[PDB]
Amino acid sequence: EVEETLKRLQSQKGVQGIIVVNTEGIPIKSTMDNPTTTQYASLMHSFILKARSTVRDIDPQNDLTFLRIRSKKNEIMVAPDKDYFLIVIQNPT
Amino acid sequence: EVEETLKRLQSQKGVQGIIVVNTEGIPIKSTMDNPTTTQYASLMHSFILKARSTVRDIDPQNDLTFLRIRSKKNEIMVAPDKDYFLIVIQNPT
Amino acid sequence: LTEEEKQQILHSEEFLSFFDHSTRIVERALSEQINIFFDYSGRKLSLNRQFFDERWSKHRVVSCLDWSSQYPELLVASYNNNEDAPHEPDGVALVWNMKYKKTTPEYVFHCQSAVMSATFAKFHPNLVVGGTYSGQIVLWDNRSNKRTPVQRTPLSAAAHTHPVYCVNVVGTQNAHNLISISTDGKICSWSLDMLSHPQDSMELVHKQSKAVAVTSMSFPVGDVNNFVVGSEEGSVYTACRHGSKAGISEMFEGHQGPITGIHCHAAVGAVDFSHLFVTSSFDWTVKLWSTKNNKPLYSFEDNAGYVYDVMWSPTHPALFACVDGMGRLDLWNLNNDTEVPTASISVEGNPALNRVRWTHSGREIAVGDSEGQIVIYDVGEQIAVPRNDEWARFGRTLAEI
Amino acid sequence: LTEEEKQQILHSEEFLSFFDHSTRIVERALSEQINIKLSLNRQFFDERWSKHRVVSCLDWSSQYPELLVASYNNNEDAPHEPDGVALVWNMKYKKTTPEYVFHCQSAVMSATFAKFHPNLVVGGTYSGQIVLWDNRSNKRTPVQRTPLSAAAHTHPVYCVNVVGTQNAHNLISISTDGKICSWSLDMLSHPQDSMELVHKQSKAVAVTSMSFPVGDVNNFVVGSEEGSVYTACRHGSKAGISEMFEGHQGPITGIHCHAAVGAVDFSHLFVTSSFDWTVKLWSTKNNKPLYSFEDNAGYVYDVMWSPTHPALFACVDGMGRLDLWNLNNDTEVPTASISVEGNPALNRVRWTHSGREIAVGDSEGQIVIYDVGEQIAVPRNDEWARFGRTLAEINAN
Amino acid sequence: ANAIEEVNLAYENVKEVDGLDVSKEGTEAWEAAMKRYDERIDRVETRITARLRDQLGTAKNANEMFRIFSRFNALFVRPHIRGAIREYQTQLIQRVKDDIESLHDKFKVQYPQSQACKMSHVRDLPPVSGSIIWAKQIDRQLTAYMKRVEDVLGKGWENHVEGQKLKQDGDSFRMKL
Amino acid sequence: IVNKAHQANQLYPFAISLIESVRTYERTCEKVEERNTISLLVAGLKKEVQALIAEGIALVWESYKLDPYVQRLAETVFNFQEKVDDLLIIEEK
């Protein structure tokens, strides 16, 4: 049940956006408009695939498991699954 | 206290080597095999620039503070600053 | 097009297992909730030039200033009696150019006496007058740069034989009147071109028969002829120029020493009545007034220094520039501050900033100092803030008990 | 590339903030994640800075909580190491290394925090100087030191505390000559109010780790050479030694007045931990021992009142037993007691500004913090005054 | 703020119950009930000391703090509040001491010695007519500081020795002015 | 010991500032004249400090100059300690 997980994450402390990629850089389950979900998760998907190629260049058996970009205004947690990935933007405080 | 910094931050388990590469792509602070990590430092800095473009392009007023790249074999945590960067690989210990 | 049915995989029984693992990673990362501790991490006054050129400003004390009421930022500075040479002129009316960025006096005018006042001929860009110390309000073509008066003044009882501390214009092309006000207990509303006979020369006398010696008077905004006369010691006088109301109407004080600076202002964002005239006085104070209230808002007691002038241009009319005898250009806002100065600057050394006048309908402050020195300011931060009713709202709070 | 360019940039006055933020960020990422009644909370140990270094004094931070200045009297062990250590540690992060080391040029004594100051670690030293450290700098050397003139401090400053609001913030640091001096928290090259606690007999009264009642008064409880707590002022005619609380037989070691009022009366009562082996409850207007506690094994190095529960106190001894005593239920026995590993001569007792936590300065090095949730601000305002009255009734046999 | 509510409530409730418009007795039990209201007063005094230390902590100089202090001098009468905020009061009196001594210095480096002489000459006020204005100028500022002296400490202004000596020296200075 | 305790009780400040001055003077002299250029630049203050300390150590054990000698050496040691920290910082980093 992803619906209870999303609804439980609505009133959580500082949630900027709960989305998830769905078609290899092209999300479907969108809680925002077209750019914030699709274009931003597309850039995140391409850059995390480049990070996969980066650590793959370090060691091909060393793929990626999780990504956490914490910044001044946002903390983007990326959960890389097999085909589609996951992008969740949260507040830093 | 540069040696004190190397000994204290290297004292934490999982840290394979404090290979701090600057923005120039040169290993300004390292304690491991220089030719193997030189390519890793240049590659990781190029993708650090990719992450900087990610943060500066998704949001205009955002600044990249810290990065966590949980890989399959290690946990490559990147510590980017305003002037230079830091690369430290910490395994899931 | 991305897919055909986008909600089928969201409703599928196997794709949600992938979402279950992804949300498991979500719950794995959301349980941190740790922030970075700081540990002592931590993370305007556009002063323009100064027209100081001793070729005609050699030890000459600046008398009242006058902004370019006809020119674009090309002010005039009247000069006090200087005895640097006996037969040479005491005061020299000098004009400069802020628009041209120089230091030498643009137009030099030295009559026989000391120009206690100097002003522009309204809607006559080719004429500047100077009310001298001996009483000869003397005319000069401004752009001709003639250092000899083109038209002197007959020293008569109806005219001024007294130092005209403030000569100024009031209305436009039809209502322009060269009103020279002196210690004669009079105003002399001369004409701009002819200065051999005053058109409306009236007395400035209250119930007493003594000739009230004026001291830094001023004119209201919009030419409503309600000129406020600063007597020999305070005594804010309300007066008119035409009809039976002409002359002295009523007095009021919030000080004792002679008034130093007083002006008016235009729109405060089309809110206030625009005649909030704040006087200043030699008894070390700066008090706000209005023609409707005999004693409104607080007297900013500018102690430790002989106050000289205040101005508040319509670009954010809540911006008066008060000074002292020890050089403190304190310009601020009552809509923002209470009594403290927002943009306060202790000028170089201890200059006696005689006149600190903002650029009307703009912002740059002409400064007439102890010596012939026209230091000019600006802010670059005190923008004309809209809804500047707080200048009146906060003022009414201080006018209750 | 070259060693000259690297060593010039690494030592440039650009990488000071880079090394500070690099150590801050890597130490911030030290919290290992996962991907699959006395509590005895934590012990503080530093290798290059906390070993055979006795703790001079501890101090809780009123601003930026969970911070304590562990001052250290650097013994004759390592002379090349900069004498005097002031380590700031973190509780909220749960780290094993000290957050920022603040060494000095002399064995730091009674280093405390500075109220209404975010980056100002103040502290007396063995050289009679109340050195000052800044949290912004990377160099752990104190940039501001204290003079040693006749008006300035002479004895090693064993107690420095702040008194006054934002209008007149005073840095009252006292020497054992009775020379009390109010200093400014910005410039440290000249004292503001310098004088000596002149007494009738033996003017130079060996004061010891004084305090102030809640309200920041000028009166401080002087732990004299033999008890004789002199509540003294700094200004006026009452400046210097004013009141004497005698009826004691030893030098006070740790003396603390009433902390923040939690749920009882103001309780203008201080407490004396001393070499007399027994804690003694006193009032600021009694001049009679209000109550003398049980003779603890060893001295009583320090004592402190909790702001949450202002009716109890924690004290220590040479054997290593921290004893907190409430008197609303107990009469002659301690409330809650716990020991530290081995037999360390526990030097300090400092309750956190938020209360219910105890910083215990051990023998040498380690600093053990405690946590409790049982003793809270229970509104027994009347029962505390009633028990104090029964104490004043039963003490007079 | 809410101290006014406490004042009104306990004021009527205890002031009109002490004897409840009945007297001529030993007037000690009546006094005890008004002592109960005095305890209510003390509680309000603590509330007012907190409130006024905040507003009087926002301003601290001899003039700025005095403005808010002057707006509440009547609250600054009773000794439980006055003796407690006496810390700030002594600071204000010391600043007024420095200010009056600066006024002495102002008459030292007076008007003809300052640029004001010539600046007054712009308005034609020579030292025979301007130094006298400087004299009454400092007289006016001294009157202001006498109000500071007698209102930082209200009816107990004489109790503060510094303010009393300032009054003496300042009035002798008025005579010099 | 009674005479020493009575004299220390009257004015312990001399001997106290002397001990304070000894530790601070060691930390002052070292970090002050630790370099050639540092000692040559601080010689202007070191001359007066050495003159006061030498005149105090020479005319020591005086009824009207012992407290003055100890206080002079202590004030000079503390001033040399502050200037020592500044000189050592300018010489090293």
CATH number for the domain spanning A91: value is: 3.30.450.30
**Residue in B closest to A77 by C-alpha:** B68
The order of strands in the sheet holding C285-288 is C278-281, C285-288, C299-300
**Interface contact C401, partner A, CB < 8 A:** no
CB contact under 8 A, D148 and F93: no
Please report the DSSP string for C58-109 in residue order.
Answer: TTPPEEEEE--SSSSS--EEEE----SSSSS-S--EEE--TTTT--S-SEEE
Name every residue whose Cβ is closer than 8 Å to that of residue A28 and which is 6 or more positions away in sequence: A22, C2, C3, C6, C7, C9, C10
Is the Cβ pair D26, B28 closer than 8 Å?
A: no
Token pair recorded at residue C248: 């002295």
d(CA C45, CA C62): 23
C-alpha–C-alpha distance, residues C311 and C294, integer Å: 21
- The boundaries of the domain holding residue C8 are 1-43
The Cα D325–Cα D317 span in angstroms is: 14
CB-CB neighbors (< 8 A) of D35 in chain B: 70, 92
Which residue of chain A comes nearest to C35, CA vs CA? A93
D129 touches chain F (CB under 8 A): yes
End-to-end Cα, chain E, rounded Å: 44
Closest CA to C395 of C340, C342, C338, C343: C338
Mutation for B interface: A55, A64, A82, most B CBs within 10 A: A55
Host domain of residue A61: 1-93
Please report residues of A whose CB lies closer than 8 A to that of C19. 2, 20
**Sheet architecture: strand order including D159-163:** D159-163, D170-174, D179-183, D193-196
For A73, the closest of B50, B51, B61 (CB atoms) is B61
Length of chain B: 93
Element (H, E) at B3: helix B2-11
Residue of C nearest to D137 (CA): C40
Max Cα separation, chain A? 40
Query: Which residue is it, tokens 């301690």?
Result: D334
C74: Cβ contacts below 8 Å, ≥ 6 apart: C68, C95, C96, C97, C98, C99, C100, C106
Any B CB within 8 A of D5 CB = no
Locate breaks in chain D with C to N over 2.5 A; list the residue preceding each.
36
Contact E91 D168 (CB under 8 A): yes
CB–CB contact A5 C26 (8 Å):
yes
What is the C-alpha separation between F67 and F55, in angstroms, rounded? 13
Chains E and B touching, counted as 3 or more CB pairs less than 8 Å apart = no
| Residues D140, B44: Cα–Cα separation, whole Å | 33
Interface D:F, Cβ pairs < 8 A = 108
Residue E164's CB is within 10 A of a number of other CB atoms, namely 16
Residue among B47, B63, B67 whose CB faces A72 most closely: B63
Query: Can you read off the two tokens belonging to residue A20?
Result: 């998830």
Are D90 and C37 an interchain contact pair (Cβ–Cβ within 8 Å)?
yes
Residue E114 in tokens = 């300052």
Residue with tokens 């701090």: B20
Adjacent-strand bridge partners of B89? B76
**Resolution of the experimentally solved model in angstroms:** 8.2
CA distances from residue C109 to C77, C261, D202 in whole angstroms, order as listed: 10, 24, 82
Nearest residue to D361 (alpha-carbon basis) of D343, D342, D348: D348
Given a contact cutoff of 8 angstroms between Cβ atoms, the answer to whether D202 and D222 are in contact is: no
Chain A residues closer than 8 Å to B63 by CB: 71-72
Please tell me if residue E124 touches chain C, with a CB cutoff of 8 Å: yes
- Record the tokens describing residue E130, joined without a space: 């301007």
Say if CB C313 and CB C361 are below 8 A apart: yes
- In angstroms, rounded to a whole number, what is the distance separating the alpha carbons of residues C276 and C46? 26
DSSP state of A38: I
Using DSSP's 3-state secondary structure scheme, residue C226 falls into coil
Q: Cα distance from B37 to chain D (closest Cα, Å)?
A: 15
Cα gap A25→A50, rounded to integer Å = 13
Is E124 in CB contact (< 8 Å) with chain D? no
Neighbours of chain E (3+ CB pairs under 8 A): C, D
* Closest C-alpha among C10, E47, C52 to residue A21: C10
Report how far residue C181's alpha carbon sits from residue A45's, in angstroms, rounded to the nearest whole number.
80
Task: Write out the DSSP string of C317-357.
Answer: SS-EEE--TT-EEEEE-TTT-SSS-SEEEE-SSS----EEE
- The answer to whether the Cβ–Cβ distance between F24 and D155 falls below 8 Å is no
How far, in Å, are B71, C98, C105 from residue C101 at the CA level?
A: 64, 5, 11
Tokens in use for C264?
């008016």
Q: Give the minimum alpha-carbon distance from D181 to chain F in angstroms, rounded to a whole number.
A: 13
The verdict on E10 touching C (C-beta cutoff 8 Å) is no
Q: Do B26 and D25 touch (CB under 8 A)?
A: no
What distance in Å separates the CA atoms of residue E90 and residue D87, rounded to the nearest whole number?
A: 38
Interface test with B, best of D25, D26, D139, D141 (most B CBs within 10 A): D26
Number of folded domains that form chain A: 1
Q: What is the DSSP secondary structure assignment for residue D282, as one 8-state letter?
A: E
Q: Do D165 and E57 touch (CB under 8 A)?
A: yes
Are B50 and A55 in contact (CB < 8 Å)?
Answer: no
How close A57 comes to chain C (CA, Å)? 25
Q: D141 in helix, strand or coil?
A: coil
How was this one solved?
cryo-EM
Show the beta-strand stretches assigned E in C183-319. 186-190, 200-203, 228-229, 236-240, 247-252, 278-281, 285-288, 299-300
8 Å CB contact of E122 and C350: no
Which residues lie below 8 Å from residue D115, measured CB to CB, with a gap of 6+?
A: D62, D63, D162, D169
- Answer yes or no: are the C-beta atoms of A90 and B74 closer than 8 Å: no
D93 touches chain B (CB under 8 A): no
Max alpha carbon distance in chain C (Å)? Answer: 110
Beta bridge partners of D243: D231
Give how far Cα D121 sits from Cα of D111, D180, F27, Å.
Answer: 7, 19, 20
Q: How close C20 gets to chain A, by Cα (Å)? A: 7
Angle between helices E161-176 and E86-108 (to 10 degrees): 20
D184, D228 contact by CB (below 8 A): no
Element (H, E) at A48: helix A40-58
Are the CB atoms for C276 and C260 separated by under 8 Å? no
* Closest C-chain CA to E111: C306
* Neighbour count for residue F14 (Cβ, 10 Å): 22
Tokens of C88: 């040479």
The two three-digit tokens of residue E143, written as one number: 């009157």
Q: CA angle at residue D185 from D179 to D186, to 5 degrees?
A: 125
Q: Do B43 and A57 touch (CB under 8 A)?
A: yes
Distance between CA atoms of A17 and A89, rounded to whole angstroms? 5
- Distance between CA atoms of D245 and D232, rounded to whole angstroms? 11
Reference D128, options D158, D104, D172; nearest CA is D158
Paired with D304 in beta bridges are: D314
